[PDB]
């Protein structure tokens, strides 16, 4: 169980973007987008929920 | 037009990164005898655009 708690919770994605590589009509504002980032500190991965 | 044989011109690739926000465009001129007088010269052509 742990292991898998621990790869979901501490896992680096990868969201697109809000400009669009291939954009629509007319539109200004592009951006990343961010989701989960590997942990950092033994503090933490402990709060991993298990 | 006297010298800009063609312009070939892509965005995406800047010089110091990429994405949406950069491009640059490539200038072939005419042949350096259609070229006369200093004037019609690169080290000119560049001034007056810049």
Same mark, same amino acid.
């Given at each position: 169980?742990?292991?898998?708690?621990?790869?979901?919770?501490?896992?680096?994605?990868?969201?697109?973007?809000?400009?669009? =590589?291939?954009?629509?009509?007319?539109?200004?504002?592009?951006?990343?987008?961010?989701?989960? =980032?590997?942990?950092?500190?033994?503090?933490?991965?402990?709060?991993?929920?298990? | 037009?006297?010298?800009?044989?063609?312009?070939?011109?892509?965005?995406?690739?800047?010089?110091?990164?990429?994405?949406?926000?950069?491009? &640059?465009?490539?200038?072939?001129?005419?042949?350096?005898?259609?070229?006369?007088?200093?004037?019609?010269?690169?080290?000119? &052509?560049?001034?007056?655009?810049?």
């Amino acid at each position: 169980d742990v292991i898998t708690a621990i790869k979901a919770q501490n896992a680096q994605v990868a969201a697109g973007q809000l400009g669009g =590589t291939p954009p629509v009509k007319g539109q200004q504002l592009n951006a990343s987008i961010i989701a989960q =980032t590997r942990l950092t500190s033994t503090e933490e991965f402990g709060k991993i929920l298990l | 037009k006297n010298n800009v044989e063609s312009v070939f011109a892509v965005n995406g690739f800047g010089f110091a990164g990429r994405g949406q926000n950069t491009g &640059i465009a490539f200038v072939s001129l005419k042949d350096w005898a259609d070229r006369p007088g200093e004037e019609n010269k690169v080290e000119a &052509i560049t001034m007056r655009a810049t």
